[PDB]
Design a protein around this ligand. Structure first.
Ligand SMILES: CSc1ccc(Br)cc1CC(=O)N1C[C@H](C(N)=O)CC[C@@H]1C
Ligand SMILES: [Zn+2]
Length: 138
């Protein structure tokens, strides 16, 4: 679990969005596993606007932050799940690191701000949904 709070927006994994997120929908994209909903209170976070390929992510299944090197945002094949059929997930960045399904929503940050959130994983892999291209967030 986890979300980004910027301005009057809340950014979450689309597959974890609540009834309230859908009732206050701003934008969603199944191909990116992202959903943005509106909030009444002002948000705490800054979004990075950079091309960093190194950063730190929070891993809830270890209660720890880990440093990572990650690939540039791209179209990557993701196996069928309870939430989506087999498809290419876009704007996804992969890195070598530990992750489990419940780690989705953990923030990836660089020196400039929030880069994205955990969205996929594998055997010693972790994938992040990029948010740096969503200029309208701030
Ligand atoms: C951190 S997720 C993870 C981690 C390790 C392993 Br093995 C497997 C996973 C599961 C995973 O990749 N998922 C991503 C998928 C998607 N984004 O389309 C939705 C379902 C599920 C949460
Ligand atoms: Zn950066």
């Amino acid at each position: 679990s986890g979300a980004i709070y910027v301005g009057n927006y809340r950014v979450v994994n689309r597959h974890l969005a609540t009834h309230n997120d859908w009732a206050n929908l701003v934008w969603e994209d199944s191909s990116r596993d992202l959903l943005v909903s509106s909030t009444t209170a002002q948000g705490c976070d800054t979004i990075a606007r950079c091309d960093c390929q190194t950063g730190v992510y929070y891993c809830s299944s270890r209660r720890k932050h880990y440093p990572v090197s990650f690939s540039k945002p791209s179209l990557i094949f993701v196996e069928a799940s309870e939430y989506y059929p087999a498809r290419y997930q876009s704007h996804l960045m992969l890195a070598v690191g530990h992750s489990e399904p419940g780690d989705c929503g953990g923030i990836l940050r660089c020196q400039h701000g929030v880069v994205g959130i955990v969205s996929t994983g594998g055997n010693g892999l972790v994938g992040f949904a990029d948010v740096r291209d969503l200029l309208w967030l701030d």
